[PDB]
Amino acid sequence: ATPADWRSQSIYFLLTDRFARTDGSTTATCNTADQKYCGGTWQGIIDKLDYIQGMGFTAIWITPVTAQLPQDCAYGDAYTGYWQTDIYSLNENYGTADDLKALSSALHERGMYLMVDVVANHMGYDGAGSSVDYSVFKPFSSQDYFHPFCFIQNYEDQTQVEDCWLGDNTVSLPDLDTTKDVVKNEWYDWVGSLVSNYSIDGLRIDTVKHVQKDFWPGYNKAAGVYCIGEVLDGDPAYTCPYQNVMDGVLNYPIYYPLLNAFKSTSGSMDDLYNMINTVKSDCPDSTLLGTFVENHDNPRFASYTNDIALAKNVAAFIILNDGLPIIYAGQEQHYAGGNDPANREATWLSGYPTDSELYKLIASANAIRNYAISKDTGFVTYKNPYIKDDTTIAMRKGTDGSQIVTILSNKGASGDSYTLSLSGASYTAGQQLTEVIGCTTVTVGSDGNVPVPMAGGLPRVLYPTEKLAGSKICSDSS
Ligand SMILES: [Ca+2]
């Protein structure tokens, strides 16, 4: 497992307790509002995962791993189960050490890959630094591995964020990094073996940005297998660049505007076409960039506009565009969610309406992506081209051998029968291009100005229809 394969794999974000559960549990008590562990065994994947496959995605992205603390801290618990007040044990709320390597060893055979998201920096403690414990921190026992105490402030600076304390008295994410050999070197050794057995064939960070330049590389290398630095900031020239340090980069910046212009019918697409461009070099790519949408710490896209179209075109472009297109857990069922605590949400809180709107769009469209490569790879690199940006967007992605997919997406669930001519996408005068998912034929002959026929947001991607043999895809029947 490692960097050049990864690039291509659709990403699927989960929790577990909330998701996983051999029990099915259609009615299981667990309303974020009250937080606290919802008895939901990780193992649930071997019975589960049919949820991911139907969609097109090849990766399993789920939460950090250990045992934080046992005592519903006012807040209501760490179930989000990012923290580390033990790192070296391996919980039980989930269910039984061994089983994990087993869940993986299992699927690993079955299909897809393994993404383990880590928060390395903070060791999470109930209490205020002056009330600091130190004894609850294995691999630690002393304070020394941790840091001094000051509230991260003067944000803009970047001469504190990377060392100082991260949090609010109510909880103090204890800062480790004495600045020198110790911490890094240390935590370096750890991961790479944690990796050894249990799975760990792709990894990620919750604490990128504020780390200190150097730690990212050291760790990225401590354990081979591809990495994803997660933290935020979304602003091409800093969020990107670190692509070199690490491996995979959060497309933090990509999302922001996609959110910005998406939602509001007239929204403001130019900000993007200019955007798509900034990254495309500014970031050392190799296609090593990450596409979220909703975002755990964020309110599931839906918090805004309550319409499929605005949703579909987004999710599609995300996936369809440059970077890992990560469909976050609950995206599908159209779970509005909340800025926080109410972002979690047992994807299973229902018996799998496995054929709802989002499921269908995901399945049929994601497939095409993977498919294209299989017969002819190289769609990876292909710098996802801006070709044209009007009131609505259309871009070009792929190789030679009439091996070309061109995507044009518009906004408004209100809809209004929309028929245009795709500008670039430069094809062969007479060439036939299928609609995608739902199907529909696009004629690119006459002048060389491809007829694009829209309804509201469906999204509309024009695939060459000559490179599909006798297979699945669109309207073959198989
Ligand atoms: Ca730190």
- The answer to whether the beta carbons of residues 69 and 78 sit under 8 Å apart is yes
**CB proximity list for 173: less than 8 A, separation 6 or greater:** 83, 121, 122, 123, 124, 125, 165, 166, 167
Q: Please say whether the beta carbons of 423 and 430 come within 8 A.
A: no
Among 414, 423, 474, 416, CA closest to 444? 423
Q: Please name the amino acid found at residue 262.
A: F
Q: Which two tokens stand for residue 451?
A: 């007829």
Residue 413 and residue 160: Cα distance in Å, rounded? Answer: 46
Ligand 1 center from residue 213 Cα (angstroms):
11
Contacts of 278 (CB under 8 A, 6+ apart): 236, 237, 253
Least Cα distance to 290 among 242, 330, 256, 323 occurs for: 323
371 with 351: CB under 8 angstroms? no
The helix or strand, by DSSP H or E, that contains position 190, with its residue range, turns out to be: helix 182-196
Report CA torsion sign: 202, 208, 212, 213: positive
Kind and range of the H or E element at 462? strand 461-464
Structure-token pair, residue 267 = 């929204």
Query: What is the amino acid identity at position 203?
Result: L
| Beta partners for residue 122, in sequence order | 175
| Residues β-bridged to residue 125 | 172
**SS3 (DSSP) at 262:** coil
Output the CA 269–ligand 1 centroid distance in Å.
Answer: 37
Kindly give, in sequence order, each residue whose CB lies less than 8 Å from that of residue 215, ignoring residues fewer than 6 positions away: 177, 184
| Number of helices and strands in the chain (H, E) | 10, 18
The β-bridge partners of 12 are 60, 327
Give the resolution to one decimal, in Å: 3.0
Please provide the DSSP assignment of 335-366 as one string: ----SSSTT---TTSSS--TTSHHHHHHHHHH
Spatial neighbors of 276 by CB under 8 A, at least 6 apart, are 321, 322, 384, 386, 395
* Per annotation, catalytic residue among 17, 86, 206, 435: 206
Known binding-site positions for Ca(2+): 121, 162, 175, 206, 210, 230
Q: After which residues is the chain broken (C to N over 2.5 A)?
A: none
CA 49 / ligand 1 centre spacing (Å): 35
Q: E strands of 96-135, at which residues?
A: 113-118
Residue 154 near residue 160 (C-beta atoms within 8 A)? yes
From the candidates 17, 77, 201, 230, give the one annotated as an active-site residue. Answer: 230
Distance CA 297, CA 141 (A): 31
Q: Which of 8, 1, 82, 42 is nearest to 379 (CA)?
A: 8
Quick one: how far is CA 174 from the chain centroid? 27
Q: Tokens 């792929």 map to which residue?
A: 398
Instruction: Give the residue ranges of DSSP H helices in 97-138.
Output: 99-110
Cα separation, 82 vs 66, whole angstroms: 9
From ligand 1's centre to the CA of 185, what distance in Å? 14
Compute CA distances 167 → 297, 389, 413, whole Å: 15, 42, 41
Maximum Cα interatomic distance, the chain, rounded to a whole number of Å: 77
User: CA–CA separation, 477 vs 329, rounded Å?
Assistant: 30
CATH code of domain 1-374: 3.20.20.80
DSSP letter at 194 equals H
Strand partners, 227: 203
Q: Name the superfamily (CATH) of residues 375-475.
A: Golgi alpha-mannosidase II (2.60.40.1180)
The C-alpha atoms of residue 235 and residue 252 are separated, in whole angstroms, by: 8
d(CA 291, CA 314): 11
| Residue 34 identity | D
CA distance 44 to 250: 28
* CA 278 – ligand 1 centroid, Å: 29
Q: Burial letters for 139-154: b for 16+ Cβ neighbours within 10 Å, e otherwise?
A: ebeebebbbeeeebee
| Helix residue ranges, H only, 215-331 | 215-222, 236-239, 252-261, 270-282, 308-320
CB 321 within 8 Å of CB 353: no
The two three-digit tokens of residue 464, written as one number: 């060459």
* Residue 328, Cβ density class (10 Å: 0-12 exposed, 13-18 middle, ≥19 buried): buried
Q: Phi and psi dihedrals of 394, rounded to 5? A: -150, 130
Residue 453 DSSP code: E
206 catalytic residue (yes or no)? yes
**Helix 357-375 and helix 308-320, axial crossing angle in degrees, nearest 10:** 20
CA distance linking residue 73 with residue 166, whole number of Å: 17
Q: Which helix (H) or strand (E) holds 41?
A: none
**Contact assessment for residue 188 and residue 195, using Cβ atoms and an 8 Å cutoff:** no
The alpha carbon of 383 is separated from its chain's Cα centroid by a whole number of angstroms, namely: 20
**Helix (H/G/I), strand (E/B), else coil: 17:** coil
Query: How far apart are the C-alpha atoms of 44 and 376, rounded to whole Å?
Result: 36
Give, in order, the Cα–Cα distances in Å from 293 to each of 60, 71, 117, 333: 17, 32, 17, 14
Domain boundaries, the chain: 1-374, 375-475
d(CA 62, CA 116): 7
Question: In DSSP terms, which residues pair with 420 in a beta bridge?
Answer: 452
What element of type H or E holds 369?
A: helix 357-375
Ligand 1 (ion): residues with CB under 5 Å are: 121, 177
Whole-number Å distance between alpha carbons of 315 and 176: 37
Tell me, yes or no, if 332 is annotated catalytic. Answer: no
Reduce the DSSP state of residue 176 to 3 states and report it. strand
> d(Cα 160, Cα 177) in Å, to the nearest integer?
12
Distance (angstroms) between ligand 1 centre and the Cα of 475 equals 53
Annotated binding site for substrate: 35, 83, 122, 204, 209-210, 234, 297, 344
Q: Which amino acid is residue 114, in one-letter code?
A: L
Q: Which two tokens stand for residue 269?
A: 């697409």
